[PDB]
Amino acid sequence: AQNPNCNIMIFHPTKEEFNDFDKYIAYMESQGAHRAGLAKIIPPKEWKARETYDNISEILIATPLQQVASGRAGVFTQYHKKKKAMTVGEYRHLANSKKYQTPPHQNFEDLERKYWKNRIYNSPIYGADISGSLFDENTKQWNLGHLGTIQDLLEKECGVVIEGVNTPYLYFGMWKTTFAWHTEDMDLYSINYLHLGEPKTWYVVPPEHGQRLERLARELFPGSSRGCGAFLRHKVALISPTVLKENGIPFNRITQEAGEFMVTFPYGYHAGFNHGFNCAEAINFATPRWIDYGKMASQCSCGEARVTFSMDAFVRILQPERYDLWKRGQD
């Protein structure tokens, strides 16, 4: 079995290997990459996403979110407070202000120490889930707006034609902006491209060990667990690497820099934080190997998780027994 320790693998495709997206994912999996839950892909030196990022300041962040924490430094939740709209240029100035800017630090490990020590004492502001793309239409390789759709994959594998669409989303981050422990909707893959700015540090649990993370989370967040048998779908809970190690949970970490792609694999729990002002693009995708994970994905039916239109068909076709309860949680 390839990659039995579930290490995060880093790939350097050539320009020729960068042509066929599906084929390269299947290649990475042939080398065991999915066992980690996360892989990094460094694009060939000849590739670019677009010509420049000099003209993005007028994009609107309609509903910036202030991420307010509660708990202790290593075990906390966050809630999202809505703020007034602002442009990307206004958000960048805010990220760089004395109140929000990255502190002085020696290296990525020092900054990670500072994040876990001090995150809860601040409330950074995040632009999230903004439908759109920064890939040039003429970028033919790994263009996250031109991927094969999840609805087409389900039709190809299973024969069922369904409604729904699959488009990318932009993220604008600052120092201490935080992504809580989660798997993707319907335990899909994700791909994330860091277009510009400062890094993102990721934490990930191997898919084969995801239930260990879920059991710790029920212990650490006991009222949330009584409220919902899939409360990690709410995307609010954080657990530090130190707490994970104290509890024996297998995990890995890596820092993504501008110009790099990350792929998350089905049922790979992940979390992380941004180092400073940045912009990322991400989208969910599927392969044939996903189908069996989609059929088994947990679901939130308490009402908290609320998701896109296109998830309806995935539940309806893959999880007909669960569909009526889940749809009630959507309404």
Ligand X SMILES: O=C(O)CNC(=O)C(=O)O
Residue 135 or residue 326: which is nearer to Zn ion going by CB?
326
User: Using the rule CB under 6 A, is 190 a contact of ligand X?
Assistant: yes
Using CB under 5 A, pick the residue from 75, 243, 302, 317 that binds Zn ion. Answer: 302
Alpha helices in the chain (DSSP H): 21-30, 88-95, 108-118, 150-158, 210-220, 222-227, 241-246, 290-296, 311-318, 320-330
Q: Mark the segment that binds Mg ion (CB under 5 A) among 5-13, 51-59, 173-181, 249-257.
A: 51-59
Contacts of residue 226, Cβ cutoff 8 Å, sequence gap at least 6: none
Q: What is the pairing mode between strands 125-131 and 65-72?
A: antiparallel
Q: Is 270 a known ligand-binding residue? A: yes
Torsion of CA 196, 199, 204, 207, to 10 degrees: 20
- For residue 270, the SS3 value is strand
Using CB under 6 A, pick the residue from 9, 111, 134, 280 that binds ligand X. Answer: 280
Q: How many amino acids of this chain bind ligand X (CB under 6 A)? A: 8
Using CB under 5 A, pick the residue from 16, 46, 54, 58 that binds Mg ion. Answer: 58
Residue 36 DSSP class: G
- Please give the radius of gyration of the chain, using alpha carbons only, rounded to the nearest integer: 19
Residue count of the chain, please give it.
Answer: 331
Contacts of residue 90, Cβ cutoff 8 Å, sequence gap at least 6: none
Cβ-contact 138, 48 below 8 angstroms: no
- For residue 179, the SS3 value is strand
Shortest Å, Cβ 87 to Mg ion = 8
Q: Binders of Ni ion among 176-215, rule CB under 5 A?
A: 190
Q: Binders of ligand X among 231-270, rule CB under 6 A?
A: 264, 270
Tally of CB atoms within 10 A around 50: 16
Residue 50 or residue 289: which is nearer to Mg ion going by CB?
50
- In the numeric block, which tokens belong to residue 301? 């039916």
Using CB under 6 A, pick the residue from 21, 76, 115, 171 that binds ligand X. Answer: 171
The item of Mg ion, Zn ion, ligand X, none sharing an interface with residue 58, based on CB under 5 to 8 Å by kind, is Mg ion
Shortest Å, Cβ 302 to Zn ion = 3
Shortest Å, Cβ 184 to Ni ion = 5
User: Using the rule CB under 5 A, is 228 a contact of Zn ion?
Assistant: yes
Using CB under 6 A, pick the residue from 111, 232, 279, 282 that binds ligand X. Answer: 282
Q: Read off the amino acid at residue 83.
A: K
Shortest Å, Cβ 268 to Ni ion = 9
- In the numeric block, which tokens belong to residue 108? 């990525």
Q: Which residues bind Mg ion (CB under 5 A)?
A: 56, 58
Q: Which residues bind ligand X (CB under 6 A)?
A: 171, 179, 190, 192, 264, 270, 280, 282
Residues belonging to the binding site for Zn(2+) are 228, 234, 300, 302
Q: Which residues bind Zn ion (CB under 5 A)?
A: 228, 300, 302, 304
